[PDB]
Design an enzyme around this catalytic site. Structure first.
Site, PDB file in Angstrom:
ATOM      1  N   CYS A   1       0.832  -1.200   0.000  1.00 20.91           N
ATOM      2  CA  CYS A   1       0.000   0.000   0.000  1.00 20.91           C
ATOM      3  C   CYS A   1       0.867   1.250   0.000  1.00 20.91           C
ATOM      4  CB  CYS A   1      -0.937   0.029   1.218  1.00 20.91           C
ATOM      5  SG  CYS A   1      -1.852   1.619   1.413  1.00 20.91           S
TER       6      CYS A   1
ATOM      7  N   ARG B   1       0.126   4.611   2.840  1.00 18.01           N
ATOM      8  CA  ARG B   1       0.204   4.421   4.285  1.00 18.01           C
ATOM      9  C   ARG B   1       0.643   5.648   5.065  1.00 18.01           C
ATOM     10  NH1 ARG B   1       3.996  -0.429   4.999  1.00 18.01           N
ATOM     11  NH2 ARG B   1       4.648  -0.014   2.839  1.00 18.01           N
TER      12      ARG B   1
ATOM     13  N   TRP C   1      -9.101   6.729  -0.560  1.00 15.63           N
ATOM     14  CA  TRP C   1      -9.394   7.444  -1.791  1.00 15.63           C
ATOM     15  C   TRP C   1      -8.463   6.885  -2.860  1.00 15.63           C
ATOM     16  CZ3 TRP C   1      -7.894  10.187   2.657  1.00 15.63           C
ATOM     17  CH2 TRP C   1      -6.522  10.480   2.733  1.00 15.63           C
TER      18      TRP C   1
ATOM     19  N   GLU D   1      -4.899   3.748 -10.536  1.00 12.41           N
ATOM     20  CA  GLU D   1      -5.767   2.592 -10.335  1.00 12.41           C
ATOM     21  C   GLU D   1      -6.928   2.608 -11.324  1.00 12.41           C
ATOM     22  OE1 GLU D   1      -6.462   1.371  -6.067  1.00 12.41           O
ATOM     23  OE2 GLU D   1      -5.969   3.479  -5.700  1.00 12.41           O
TER      24      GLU D   1
HETATM   25  C1  HEM Z   1      -5.697   6.719   2.147  1.00 10.69           C
HETATM   26  C2  HEM Z   1      -5.691   6.539   0.825  1.00 10.69           C
HETATM   27  C3  HEM Z   1      -5.158   5.222   0.206  1.00 10.69           C
HETATM   28  C4  HEM Z   1      -4.522   5.139  -0.977  1.00 10.69           C
HETATM   29  C5  HEM Z   1      -4.180   6.320  -1.918  1.00 10.69           C
HETATM   30  C6  HEM Z   1      -4.185   3.745  -1.205  1.00 10.69           C
HETATM   31  C7  HEM Z   1      -3.518   3.251  -2.316  1.00 10.69           C
HETATM   32  C8  HEM Z   1      -3.331   1.917  -2.617  1.00 10.69           C
HETATM   33  C9  HEM Z   1      -2.984   1.338  -3.903  1.00 10.69           C
HETATM   34  C10 HEM Z   1      -2.754   2.114  -5.224  1.00 10.69           C
HETATM   35  C11 HEM Z   1      -2.886   0.008  -3.742  1.00 10.69           C
HETATM   36  C12 HEM Z   1      -2.558  -0.998  -4.868  1.00 10.69           C
HETATM   37  C13 HEM Z   1      -3.875  -1.691  -5.242  1.00 10.69           C
HETATM   38  C14 HEM Z   1      -3.763  -2.126  -6.682  1.00 10.69           C
HETATM   39  O1  HEM Z   1      -3.045  -1.420  -7.425  1.00 10.69           O
HETATM   40  O2  HEM Z   1      -4.381  -3.145  -7.100  1.00 10.69           O
HETATM   41  C15 HEM Z   1      -3.183  -0.320  -2.343  1.00 10.69           C
HETATM   42  C16 HEM Z   1      -3.193  -1.573  -1.732  1.00 10.69           C
HETATM   43  C17 HEM Z   1      -3.594  -1.877  -0.422  1.00 10.69           C
HETATM   44  N1  HEM Z   1      -3.986  -0.957   0.550  1.00 10.69           N
HETATM   45 FE1  HEM Z   1      -3.920   1.085   0.361  1.00 10.69          FE
HETATM   46  N2  HEM Z   1      -4.666   3.002  -0.125  1.00 10.69           N
HETATM   47  C18 HEM Z   1      -5.279   3.878   0.771  1.00 10.69           C
HETATM   48  C19 HEM Z   1      -5.899   3.523   1.970  1.00 10.69           C
HETATM   49  C20 HEM Z   1      -5.854   2.290   2.589  1.00 10.69           C
HETATM   50  C21 HEM Z   1      -6.539   1.905   3.817  1.00 10.69           C
HETATM   51  C22 HEM Z   1      -7.468   2.873   4.595  1.00 10.69           C
HETATM   52  C23 HEM Z   1      -6.231   0.615   4.080  1.00 10.69           C
HETATM   53  C24 HEM Z   1      -6.653  -0.303   5.251  1.00 10.69           C
HETATM   54  C25 HEM Z   1      -7.266   0.113   6.366  1.00 10.69           C
HETATM   55  C26 HEM Z   1      -5.325   0.155   3.035  1.00 10.69           C
HETATM   56  C27 HEM Z   1      -4.753  -1.097   2.916  1.00 10.69           C
HETATM   57  C28 HEM Z   1      -4.299  -1.648   1.722  1.00 10.69           C
HETATM   58  C29 HEM Z   1      -4.079  -3.058   1.458  1.00 10.69           C
HETATM   59  C30 HEM Z   1      -4.293  -4.205   2.466  1.00 10.69           C
HETATM   60  C31 HEM Z   1      -3.661  -3.198   0.190  1.00 10.69           C
HETATM   61  C32 HEM Z   1      -3.321  -4.560  -0.449  1.00 10.69           C
HETATM   62  C33 HEM Z   1      -1.903  -4.880   0.003  1.00 10.69           C
HETATM   63  C34 HEM Z   1      -1.563  -6.361   0.037  1.00 10.69           C
HETATM   64  O3  HEM Z   1      -2.099  -7.141  -0.816  1.00 10.69           O
HETATM   65  O4  HEM Z   1      -0.745  -6.736   0.937  1.00 10.69           O
HETATM   66  N3  HEM Z   1      -5.127   1.201   2.149  1.00 10.69           N
HETATM   67  N4  HEM Z   1      -3.435   0.883  -1.704  1.00 10.69           N
HETATM   68  C1  LIG Z   2      -8.439   1.548   0.712  1.00  7.57           C
HETATM   69  C2  LIG Z   2      -7.922   1.551  -0.701  1.00  7.57           C
HETATM   70  C3  LIG Z   2      -7.537   2.733  -1.322  1.00  7.57           C
HETATM   71  C4  LIG Z   2      -7.061   2.705  -2.633  1.00  7.57           C
HETATM   72  N1  LIG Z   2      -6.696   3.858  -3.233  1.00  7.57           N
HETATM   73  N2  LIG Z   2      -6.978   1.536  -3.305  1.00  7.57           N
HETATM   74  C5  LIG Z   2      -7.312   0.374  -2.698  1.00  7.57           C
HETATM   75  C6  LIG Z   2      -7.249  -0.892  -3.455  1.00  7.57           C
HETATM   76  C7  LIG Z   2      -6.832  -2.079  -2.891  1.00  7.57           C
HETATM   77  C8  LIG Z   2      -6.826  -3.238  -3.663  1.00  7.57           C
HETATM   78 CL1  LIG Z   2      -6.240  -4.740  -2.852  1.00  7.57          CL
HETATM   79  C9  LIG Z   2      -7.254  -3.206  -5.003  1.00  7.57           C
HETATM   80  C10 LIG Z   2      -7.701  -1.988  -5.551  1.00  7.57           C
HETATM   81  C11 LIG Z   2      -8.193  -1.759  -6.977  1.00  7.57           C
HETATM   82  N3  LIG Z   2      -7.857  -2.805  -7.953  1.00  7.57           N
HETATM   83  C12 LIG Z   2      -9.045  -3.653  -8.149  1.00  7.57           C
HETATM   84  C13 LIG Z   2      -7.468  -2.165  -9.226  1.00  7.57           C
HETATM   85  C14 LIG Z   2      -7.698  -0.858  -4.754  1.00  7.57           C
HETATM   86  C15 LIG Z   2      -7.810   0.354  -1.399  1.00  7.57           C
END
Ligand code: HEM
Ligand SMILES: Cc1cc(N)nc(-c2cc(Cl)cc(CN(C)C)c2)c1
Ligand SMILES: C[C@H](O)[C@H](O)[C@H]1CNc2nc(N)[nH]c(=O)c2N1
Ligand SMILES: [Zn+2]
Length: 415
Positions: A113, A116, A285, A290
């Site tokens: 992520c 964070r 958000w 994405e």
């Molecule tokens: C605050 C704004 C946030 C942004 C901009 C963000 C951004 C992202 C992005 C771009 C990904 C990659 C997903 C993909 O490309 O398929 C991701 C993964 C992830 N995010 Fe964040 N996220 C946010 C908030 C959060 C929150 C609030 C949580 C949990 C409480 C979180 C937990 C995770 C987890 C668990 C993953 C998957 C990681 C894994 O598979 O180990 N995120 N996030």
């Molecule tokens: C809280 C949060 C914020 C963000 N900005 N993104 C994510 C996200 C996580 C996963 Cl595991 C997958 C995806 C979207 N994929 C299906 C393309 C988004 C989650």
């Protein structure tokens, strides 16, 4: 035993000791690296009472060391108290504060992520008193409304009752709370989101009347205390959507694309002190890529690089005209612009990757490290003109943590 990570764009070196507290395993060995396996056998999630107290003790030690009361009486009494409850019940219940801490640190430790930097400003909604699918719907509706906040999005997680036996699991069957439907066509092609074609049919299997179009918000499939799941429609006024326009190309509106404001993952599993929360929808958000790169341009998703290139009038005969790359940048300029002109929170891949480096600095300073998965941190376009491309990252797994879990319909003993 005190590893170093270098940034090759700035010559900045950071020392990681945090990996020493790591517990889980990564999938790699001394003779193989599996850092590009998507769902490694490790990253997926049954517990016994004997295993539970080490996990509980480990976690309570972190929490009390956090509130600057480590090993004191209130700690030792809470250690004994949980120890005793794991005798009585072969499980235990987290204090509200312990829940908020675990949830925030599961996010903090999510190494894939890039967002964070915001891990400590997370709004925890305790739904552990829920008993019914209708209750879940109500809790999930209040989550969407609170997190959306009229476009000024806010981070939040709603935590449903923890697993107990295993056959009484609370599950949200959707992969995200808000996703568009996908319908295969009577000629093979696909309308809407191809990702959700199976799930869309499972909803129609359970009675969903589909408007069968492009951007049809799916109903919620909610399973409560192991019972069969039930369909619920999020009141449309709670689903905030952004119609996608371009700031130069007036034909871009006629593309008729839109995306929802709120990314909210609902299929993962939250682990805290050895306790397993099978339903824990969490939202933040979007980073623009994405939507504009993966959702819109993955060959197996919406796949619009075809049509955007046409309207731009591009040399589409030769692979090396880079017409794909060119249409890809405009598409993401439009997503960013559309979300910003509507006051809906969104972050560009440049701003978010810079904040991650800043975040990485804080974690190595006031924590000793920051687990990070380069394969996932680097944005899916313009890799090396973002600072994370040039930043070495150690990946290791800490708890509390979010974990993947099998889809409920491959495991639910139906009726
Ligand atoms: C605050 C704004 C946030 C942004 C901009 C963000 C951004 C992202 C992005 C771009 C990904 C990659 C997903 C993909 O490309 O398929 C991701 C993964 C992830 N995010 Fe964040 N996220 C946010 C908030 C959060 C929150 C609030 C949580 C949990 C409480 C979180 C937990 C995770 C987890 C668990 C993953 C998957 C990681 C894994 O598979 O180990 N995120 N996030
Ligand atoms: C809280 C949060 C914020 C963000 N900005 N993104 C994510 C996200 C996580 C996963 Cl595991 C997958 C995806 C979207 N994929 C299906 C393309 C988004 C989650
Ligand atoms: C094969 C590879 O592991 C897989 O495509 C990964 C690569 N990196 C990624 N990075 C992000 N953020 N999201 C993804 O879905 C993926 N997919
Ligand atoms: Zn490796």
């Amino acid at each position: 035993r005190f590893l170093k990570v270098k940034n090759w764009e700035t010559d900045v070196v950071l020392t990681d000791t945090l990996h020493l507290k790591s517990t889980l395993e990564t999938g790699c060995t001394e003779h193989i690296c599996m850092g590009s396996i998507m769902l490694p056998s490790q990253h997926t999630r049954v517990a016994t009472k004997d295993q539970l107290f080490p996990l509980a003790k480990e976690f309570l030690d972190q929490y009390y060391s956090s509130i600057k009361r480590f090993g004191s009486k209130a700690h030792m009494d809470r250690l004994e108290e949980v120890n005793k409850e794991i005798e009585s019940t072969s499980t235990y219940q987290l204090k509200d504060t312990e829940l908020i801490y675990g949830a925030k640190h599961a996010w903090r430790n999510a190494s894939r992520c890039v967002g964070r930097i915001q891990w400590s400003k997370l709004q925890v909604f305790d739904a552990r008193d829920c008993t019914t699918a209708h209750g879940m719907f109500n809790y999930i509706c209040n989550h969407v409304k609170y997190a959306t906040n009229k476009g000024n999005l806010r981070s939040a997680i709603t935590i449903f009752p923890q697993r107990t036996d295993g056959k009484h699991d609370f599950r949200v069957w959707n992969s995200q709370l808000i996703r568009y439907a996908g319908y295969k066509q009577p000629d093979g092609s696909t309308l809407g989101d191809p990702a959700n074609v199976q799930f869309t049919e499972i909803c129609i299997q359970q009675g969903w009347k589909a408007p069968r179009g492009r951007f049809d918000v799916l109903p919620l499939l909610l399973q409560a205390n192991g019972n069969d799941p039930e369909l619920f429609q999020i009141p449309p006024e709670l689903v905030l959507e952004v119609p996608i326009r371009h700031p130069k190309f007036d034909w871009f509106k006629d593309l008729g694309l839109k995306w929802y404001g709120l990314p909210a993952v609902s299929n993962m599993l939250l682990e805290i002190g050895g306790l397993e929360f099978s339903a824990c929808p969490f939202s933040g958000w979007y980073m623009g890529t994405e939507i504009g790169v993966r959702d819109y341009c993955d060959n197996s998703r919406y796949n619009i690089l075809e049509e955007v290139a046409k309207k731009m009038d591009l040399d589409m005969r030769k692979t090396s005209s880079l017409w794909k790359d060119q249409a890809l940048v405009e598409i993401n300029i439009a997503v960013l612009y559309s979300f910003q002109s509507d006051k809906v929170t969104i972050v560009d891949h440049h701003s978010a990757t810079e904040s991650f480096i800043k975040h990485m600095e804080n974690e190595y300073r006031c924590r000793g490290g920051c687990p990070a998965d380069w394969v996932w941190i680097v944005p899916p376009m313009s890799g090396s003109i973002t600072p994370v491309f040039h930043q070495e990252m150690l990946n290791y797994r800490l708890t509390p943590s979010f974990e993947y879990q099998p889809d409920p319909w491959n495991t639910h003993v139906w009726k």
